[PDB]
Amino acid sequence: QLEPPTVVETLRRGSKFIKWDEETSSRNLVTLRVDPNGFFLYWTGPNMEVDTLDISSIRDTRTGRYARLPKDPKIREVLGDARLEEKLMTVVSGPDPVNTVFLNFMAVQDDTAKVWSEELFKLAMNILAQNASRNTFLRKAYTKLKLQVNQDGRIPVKNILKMFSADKKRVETALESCGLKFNRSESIRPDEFSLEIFERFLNKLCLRPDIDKILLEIGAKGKPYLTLEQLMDFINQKQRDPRLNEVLYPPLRPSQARLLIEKYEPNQQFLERDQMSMEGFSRYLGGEENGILPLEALDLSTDMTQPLSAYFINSSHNTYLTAGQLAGTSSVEMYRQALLWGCRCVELDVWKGRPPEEEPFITHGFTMTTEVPLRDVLEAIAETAFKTSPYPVILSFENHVDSAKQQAKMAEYCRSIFGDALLIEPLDKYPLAPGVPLPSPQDLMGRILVKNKKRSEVNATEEMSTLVNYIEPVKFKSFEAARKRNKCFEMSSFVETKAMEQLTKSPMEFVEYNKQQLSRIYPKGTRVDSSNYMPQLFWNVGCQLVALNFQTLDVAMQLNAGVFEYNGRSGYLLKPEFMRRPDKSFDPFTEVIVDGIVANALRVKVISGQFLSDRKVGIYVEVDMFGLPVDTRRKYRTRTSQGNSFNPVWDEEPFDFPKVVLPTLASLRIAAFEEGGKFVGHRILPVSAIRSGYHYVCLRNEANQPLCLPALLIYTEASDYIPDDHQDYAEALINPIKHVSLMDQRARQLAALIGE
Amino acid sequence: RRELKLLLLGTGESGKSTFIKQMRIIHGSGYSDEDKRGFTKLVYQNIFTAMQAMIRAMDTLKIPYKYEHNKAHAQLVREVDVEKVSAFENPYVDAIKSLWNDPGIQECYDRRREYQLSDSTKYYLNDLDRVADPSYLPTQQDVLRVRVPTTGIIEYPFDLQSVIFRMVDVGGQRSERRKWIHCFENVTSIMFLVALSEYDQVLVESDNENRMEESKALFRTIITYPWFQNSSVILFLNKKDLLEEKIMYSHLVDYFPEYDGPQRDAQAAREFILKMFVDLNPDSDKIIYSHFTCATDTENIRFVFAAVKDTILQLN
Ligand SMILES: Nc1nc2c(ncn2[C@@H]2O[C@H](COP(=O)(O)OP(=O)(O)O)[C@@H](O)[C@H]2O)c(=O)[nH]1
Ligand code: ALF
Ligand SMILES: [Ca+2]
Numbered sequence A: 001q002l003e004p005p006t007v008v009e010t011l012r013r014g015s016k017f018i019k020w021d022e023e024t025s026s027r028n029l030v031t032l033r034v035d036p037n038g039f040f041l042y043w044t045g046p047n048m049e050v051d052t053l054d055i056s057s058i059r060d061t062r063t064g065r066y067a068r069l070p071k072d073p074k075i076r077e078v079l080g081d082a083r084l085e086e087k088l089m090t091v092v093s094g095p096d097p098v099n100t101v102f103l104n105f106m107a108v109q110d111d112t113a114k115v116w117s118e119e120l121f122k123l124a125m126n127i128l129a130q131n132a133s134r135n136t137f138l139r140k141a142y143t144k145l146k147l148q149v150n151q152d153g154r155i156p157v158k159n160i161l162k163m164f165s166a167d168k169k170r171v172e173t174a175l176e177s178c179g180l181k182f183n184r185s186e187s188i189r190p191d192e193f194s195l196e197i198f199e200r201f202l203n204k205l206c207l208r209p210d211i212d213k214i215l216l217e218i219g220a221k222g223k224p225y226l227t228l229e230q231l232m233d234f235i236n237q238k239q240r241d242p243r244l245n246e247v248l249y250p251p252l253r254p255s256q257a258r259l260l261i262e263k264y265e266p267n268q269q270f271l272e273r274d275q276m277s278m279e280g281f282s283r284y285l286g287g288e289e290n291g292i293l294p295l296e297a298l299d300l301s302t303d304m305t306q307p308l309s310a311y312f313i314n315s316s317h318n319t320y321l322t323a324g325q326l327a328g329t330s331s332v333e334m335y336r337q338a339l340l341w342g343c344r345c346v347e348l349d350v351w352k353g354r355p356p357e358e359e360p361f362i363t364h365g366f367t368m369t370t371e372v373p374l375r376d377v378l379e380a381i382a383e384t385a386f387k388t389s390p391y392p393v394i395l396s397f398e399n400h401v402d403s404a405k406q407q408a409k410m411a412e413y414c415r416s417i418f419g420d421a422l423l424i425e426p427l428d429k430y431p432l433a434p435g436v437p438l439p440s441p442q443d444l445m446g447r448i449l450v451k452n453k454k455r456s457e458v459n460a461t462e463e464m465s466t467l468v469n470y471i472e473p474v475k476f477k478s479f480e481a482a483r484k485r486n487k488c489f490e491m492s493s494f495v496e497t498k499a500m501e502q503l504t505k506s507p508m509e510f511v512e513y514n515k516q517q518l519s520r521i522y523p524k525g526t527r528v529d530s531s532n533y534m535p536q537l538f539w540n541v542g543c544q545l546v547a548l549n550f551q552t553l554d555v556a557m558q559l560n561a562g563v564f565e566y567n568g569r570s571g572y573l574l575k576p577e578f579m580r581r582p583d584k585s586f587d588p589f590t591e592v593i594v595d596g597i598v599a600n601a602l603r604v605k606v607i608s609g610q611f612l613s614d615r616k617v618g619i620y621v622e623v624d625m626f627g628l629p630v631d632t633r634r635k636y637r638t639r640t641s642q643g644n645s646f647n648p649v650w651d652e653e654p655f656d657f658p659k660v661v662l663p664t665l666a667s668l669r670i671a672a673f674e675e676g677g678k679f680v681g682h683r684i685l686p687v688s689a690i691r692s693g694y695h696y697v698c699l700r701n702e703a704n705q706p707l708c709l710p711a712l713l714i715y716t717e718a719s720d721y722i723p724d725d726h727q728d729y730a731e732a733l734i735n736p737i738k739h740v741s742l743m744d745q746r747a748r749q750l751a752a753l754i755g756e
Numbered sequence B: 001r002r003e004l005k006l007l008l009l010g011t012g013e014s015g016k017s018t019f020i021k022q023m024r025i026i027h028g029s030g031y032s033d034e035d036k037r038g039f040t041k042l043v044y045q046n047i048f049t050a051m052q053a054m055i056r057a058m059d060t061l062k063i064p065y066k067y068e069h070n071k072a073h074a075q076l077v078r079e080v081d082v083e084k085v086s087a088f089e090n091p092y093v094d095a096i097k098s099l100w101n102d103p104g105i106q107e108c109y110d111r112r113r114e115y116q117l118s119d120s121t122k123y124y125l126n127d128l129d130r131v132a133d134p135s136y137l138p139t140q141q142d143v144l145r146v147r148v149p150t151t152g153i154i155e156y157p158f159d160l161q162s163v164i165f166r167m168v169d170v171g172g173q174r175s176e177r178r179k180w181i182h183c184f185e186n187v188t189s190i191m192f193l194v195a196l197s198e199y200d201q202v203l204v205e206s207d208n209e210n211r212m213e214e215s216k217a218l219f220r221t222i223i224t225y226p227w228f229q230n231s232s233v234i235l236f237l238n239k240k241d242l243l244e245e246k247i248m249y250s251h252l253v254d255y256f257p258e259y260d261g262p263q264r265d266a267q268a269a270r271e272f273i274l275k276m277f278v279d280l281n282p283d284s285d286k287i288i289y290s291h292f293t294c295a296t297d298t299e300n301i302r303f304v305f306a307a308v309k310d311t312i313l314q315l316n
């Protein structure tokens, strides 16, 4: 049940709010609207200038208690306890957890903020919206130009120039060509700025020789048209994932091919003859059916009834920190940001409060970092834990606090703040005994599990240890000892370099350990500027809770945010079958394919890109793969483009990954960069789900938010793996009649000559 | 303890997965009442799939609905998305019962050969009252009859007394057979399944080629492979009960004209088919142990696999 983003009539027609601010203490009455497609939240502020917030840039919406209150006495005088706070709405947007802008509104009408807060949140977290078609993102760009209008309601030409600021001389020529106004000083009537005319403008702006090359490839030398059969055969042969079953995923019928033409083909002459022109074909390529991924991968479609140890879990390290380890702010907000982003394991370094209050507070190992009270963090966790994901959240305490009284306070705080959500005693089905497996995420939906010692860190008391059950941390002796004990509720943490040691020396024992119990991994102390280790290193040996610094968006975190988007942003990813089964065992360092595991081969050819930079600069694209050490390559790179950034085309050889031993663990990273190294955008795609054929890859920022204009056209072939020597055998299994028919003919021809 | 690896190979819908379930019933853990509830949804979906296939075949083959009021029922049922079905209530129960009762739909069922329709359709549709029941719990036969397309490669270990059999289930469709090479290491024995009933049908993946022609060609190819030099080859000629039914009105002569035996005789027909598979293979020199099976029949497979157990252990 993944419905598309729907904008209720209230949000369309609009509601009256007063937008206020704490910085400049500004107060302005505005009308909030959201466009029918749900792309932009937009309002008209001072005089008549139209402001827009991109909904995909929203990280959270808040109301009532959780809304940011006006502490300034001047603003508060214009407003006014319970009912005044009840109609507050705070919108939190930003490109990453650390860099968040807060926009505050208060409705004039009663219980309006409650609706707007909830409805914006649904639009923001909508899955189809974030994974929209290429065309839909171009329609979003169109919508922006139509909203951001001058005071007299017209679309100024300079906004169109700003949006495509690279080659502004070509932009003017395209505008002139459509009979539109093209001088910088003038503006266009919305009446006259049709979506069809916008599309016509984009076609005259960007010439597409790459799409011409593709039409000629697909049996159309008489090129301006393409028949129903040619289209259908193209979709069934080139655009289809060959790994998929013909029954589960049936091929396109001619009746369906017709419906595609009705949808995309603009020219009536081609439609009635059952054909598709370049304009229809170019539309289909960026359409809703020809996405690079299937909806199953993005949907919450994974089995969630397996034991907790059988999943990779999204994990944070010293969540509270916004920058470095030694110096910087400790934020309560970071807990909200992590949990909203799908993190299911957050770390709390609790310390002993001073004599007057004696309130436990969170901070780093008594460094030059600021402090935040524990009460506020727990309250922020409850607020956001199950907002984007219903599956359990583990609280990783690094408990100091060496006083029984403050220990009982924090245990009491957990009880009262979380309520029923806190798991305090074990479930009936899963007793804390030897041989009993860990409960499933399904069994623990909407539950807070505490992870703290019982009986460096400080010892526990009767109040704090009694909350611990399925996730008890213990000092790791060895894999021999863990196997001897046979207890799934015990777990151990590993510092990066100790985890690296066990990885290189006892990889297989580690995978066998992680079948039954949990292992958490965190970075070493040396990483004082909050650097991250490649998490893939330990996912390869089955480690579930690979913790990272969410404030730092290096490649490590980009990968983490990318892979955890899948399975409905639940925060849990199911491990490969052979890393979960007790009766199986493979070496993580295999250079050769494993029996029982279907390997894959991948072909990635980078064809072209669009609107990649806002200025004229050369661009190159990296194509990496992450997974097992054998599967990992990351030297592939296109030649830097010619200086073109509107529509650069690469005449490039394909990037082959001929043997993916364990594809269900393999993630392909496509990342675009300007000449000089500046990041443009990227995308993480699971190798097992990626489609074959020509597809647009709409790019994302470092934090995995979808960029609107930047996009790449790529050709892919993801097939099941076949070794060289054993290729003739494969062809015969796939089509045995042809082969056996030939052999039976040969024998039939020898009938007379053999005689007897 | 000794562990031996067997492959369940065959073309699509031959019965590979149904055999696995009998292994689970006989040698494995069997199906508790809890496990059986897991199939309730799958049974509902099988019924919707089957009737949708027949509703589409009324158009394809130009068969009129006998009774006028079933057109509205047909339109109700065709619009359903089978993937989101989790219950079998009205108006869909009465709609499907009314359609199944229509002489036009019955004539369309008679001509199921001319399109793709699952073989457990009659089994379920004659038993709608039992399934439609609000407190319905699938029987063990219901679970054996259910149709769930296999994809990829799944190994099932079974603990028999003297040995552990690690049996590998695979998908039978053409695209699936590209994956098969990834389960060919260290194979003790191949167990090839063949639908005896498929002699007059055509493939789902290629609606111009004979199903048995594929099964024959696949078998005669696969047994000559380097991986199986020291492997035994058991041949299960499955669905013998459906052959008994079909051979009365669908003549084997009309699809394999080299058959010179009499019409309406299952024994003669199945023995000819066995001959097509095993006889005259220039490349193959190994003995083939055939058995005529009905994979949905637990007592048949208990007897049959007891013999195959003895044969495999003997050789290894
Ligand atoms: N009547 C009958 N039906 C069978 C027999 N074997 C399998 N089936 C049914 O035919 C369908 C295909 O079986 P399945 O095991 O999924 O085929 P696979 O694709 O080869 O695994 C299922 O609905 C089974 O219940 C049989 O011996 N007799
Ligand atoms: F060969 Al199948 F379902 F068609 F296992
Ligand atoms: Ca810490």
Ligand SMILES: [Mg+2]
Pocket (backbone or CB within 6 Å): B016, B017, B018, B148, B149, B150
């Ligand atoms: Mg099957």
